[PDB]
């Protein structure tokens, strides 16, 4: 059904010690597959499906553009610094571009850029023009709308980006379509007259999950605290959900976990030890 492609890119002045200044990270359905860095200077695989099913020509081809982009984005640091009237310091440039496809056909085509954590330029596919947010984005706006860069980006987001994403999904249909059980553990702590109940899901795939605390059948999201969905090293996901309650009402509270891997929502009551 829905398949998303995203290319996260970062250009840094202060990496700082023993770290690469230029990093290009790729994503397929919210999962890391490709990576590029200023020290290695080569595009390397991160998943099994992209390493085997993709040709050697693809790796040498992506590296050619990758090395070229690194040299272009190197001068881009200085271009902004001279425009903003900056001598130096900690400054970073961010890039976010990709496509979202639904049942084959594309539904989204974005190209966004930011400087020092603030929106700089954003491409509009409909009007074929680059939107300026900061008054320092007008020279970039006049530069790209002048040549064939606007036409080339529109051709990429509608053809090149769409055609290749269909292949990436076909290559990793088993690794993206898989489902893993989270393994839920419940623990409670006694503080200054307040009982803090914790619900933890360790390793689940895909990323979306619904972990909420229930009191006497009714869902309580008013007092419940959540740290969102955090990723793991292997490729799976983790989540942290807590709730503050009065001591003695441990039987009334139940943690419900809703996931694609489970056919029915898993209930987890807090049974203590007291030993």
């Amino acid at each position: 059904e829905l398949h998303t492609l995203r290319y996260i890119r970062t250009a840094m002045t202060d990496p700082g010690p023993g770290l690469p200044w230029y990093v290009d990270v790729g994503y397929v359905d919210g999962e890391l597959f490709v990576h590029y860095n200023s020290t290695a200077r080569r595009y390397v695989p991160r998943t099994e499906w992209i390493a085997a099913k993709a040709d050697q020509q693809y790796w040498d081809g992506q590296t050619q553009i990758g090395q070229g982009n690194e040299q272009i984005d190197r001068e881009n640091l200085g271009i902004l610094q001279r425009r903003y009237n900056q001598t130096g310091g900690s400054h970073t440039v961010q890039w976010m571009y990709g496509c979202d496809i639904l049942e084959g056909g594309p539904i989204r085509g974005y190209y966004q850029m930011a400087y020092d954590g603030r929106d700089f330029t954003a491409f509009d596919k409909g009007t074929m023009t680059f939107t300026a947010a900061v008054p320092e984005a007008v020279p970039t706006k006049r530069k790209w709308e002048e040549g064939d860069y606007a036409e080339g980006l529109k051709q990429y987001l509608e053809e090149t980006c769409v055609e290749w994403l269909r292949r990436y999904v076909e290559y990793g249909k088993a690794e993206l379509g898989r489902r893993e059980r989270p393994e839920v553990r419940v623990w409670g702590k006694e503080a200054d007259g307040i009982l803090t109940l914790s619900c933890r899901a360790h390793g689940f795939y895909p990323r979306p999950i619904v972990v909420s605390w229930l009191k006497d059948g009714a869902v309580r999201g008013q007092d419940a605290h959540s740290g969102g969905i955090v990723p793991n090293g292997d490729g799976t996901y983790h989540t942290w959900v807590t709730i503050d309650a009065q001591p003695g009402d441990g039987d009334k509270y139940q943690c419900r976990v809703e996931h694609a891997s489970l056919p029915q929502p898993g209930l987890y009551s807090w049974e203590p030890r007291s030993g």
């Binding site: 982009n69 272009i72 881009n76 271009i79 020279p139 530069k143 860069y149």
Partner: peptide
């Protein structure tokens, strides 16, 4: 496939 960058 990555898109080629241009000078600002």
């Amino acid at each position: 496939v990555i898109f080629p960058a241009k000078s600002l």
